[PDB]
Amino acid sequence: GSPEFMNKQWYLLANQLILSLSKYEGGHIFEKLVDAKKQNCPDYYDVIKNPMSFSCIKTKLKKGQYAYPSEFVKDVQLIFDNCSLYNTSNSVVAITGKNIETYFNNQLIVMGYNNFILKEKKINDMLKLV
Ligand SMILES: Cc1ccccc1-c1[nH]c(C)c2c1CCCCC2=O
């Protein structure tokens, strides 16, 4: 397809997808960066050195700071990885995090978003062939 047209497309799906995650059940705990004091987890940024939240990703989208479709997924997946790292598997937060992660990955399938990630790869090979 048209290269800039494609970029407009997956940008639209990303902005849609981050919004669905904000409204999904429990998504509000990933909306903002954790305030270690107000959540009384005062060791959070001793454990999590690469913090990420839905609002950070929204700002990147708004600022046009994603060059590839995989870069958006990587940031969302980072939220889920921080969540499972910090919270024990039998905790409310860990369980909530795995529920949103399953939903995010399934939206990637339903929305055709993964085809944009596949496209990104072959273009970079097509560029390697030059
Ligand atoms: C549980 C909660 C409520 C309101 C705002 C943020 C949170 C939250 N969101 C994450 C990803 C958290 C926490 C605090 C509990 C332990 C640390 C954590 O992973």
From TrEMBL:
Transmembrane segments: none annotated. Residues 22-94 form the Bromo domain. This is Bromodomain protein 1. It comes from Plasmodium falciparum (isolate 3D7). The lineage of its organism: Eukaryota, Sar, Alveolata, Apicomplexa, Aconoidasida.
